[PDB]
Ligand binder design. Structure first.
Ligand SMILES: [Ca+2]
Ligand SMILES: [Ca+2]
Ligand SMILES: [Cl-]
Length: 54
DNA sequence: GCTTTTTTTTTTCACAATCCCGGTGCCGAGGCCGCTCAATTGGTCGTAGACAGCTCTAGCACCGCTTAAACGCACGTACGGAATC
């Protein structure tokens, strides 16, 4: 148990910050609990809507 | 049909404005540096919700009368809408 480094954005194959998105969900008063996929799905959508506009 | 006009459309140009080009200069996009704080890891601990099994609500199908409501036509009158000053 000392095996560190990887980011969730990298796991999901994304550019947008999954971790940040997660925190933002958690800190936003949206729901008491937040699934582990919730931010991944969301971030990916924001990536796509961002990419489409650009 | 006449002639004799006034209008509309064509042709013609002048001219005004906007578009295109190469050149110059500034500053903010862009990328890097060096520090830090927030994302990550691995722990623990508890309950949310996924599940299975059961109750009984209420949503659907159907039937068969009774009108109120939709339909389809005749009829003419006011309306929408062109033209003109
Ligand atoms: Ca329950
Ligand atoms: Ca059930
Ligand atoms: Cl999830």
């Amino acid at each position: 148990a000392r095996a560190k480094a990887k980011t969730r954005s990298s796991r999901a194959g994304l550019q947008f910050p999954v971790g940040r998105v997660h925190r933002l969900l958690r800190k936003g008063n949206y729901s008491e609990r937040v699934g582990a996929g919730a931010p991944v799905y969301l971030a990916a959508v924001l990536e796509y809507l961002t990419a489409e506009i650009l």
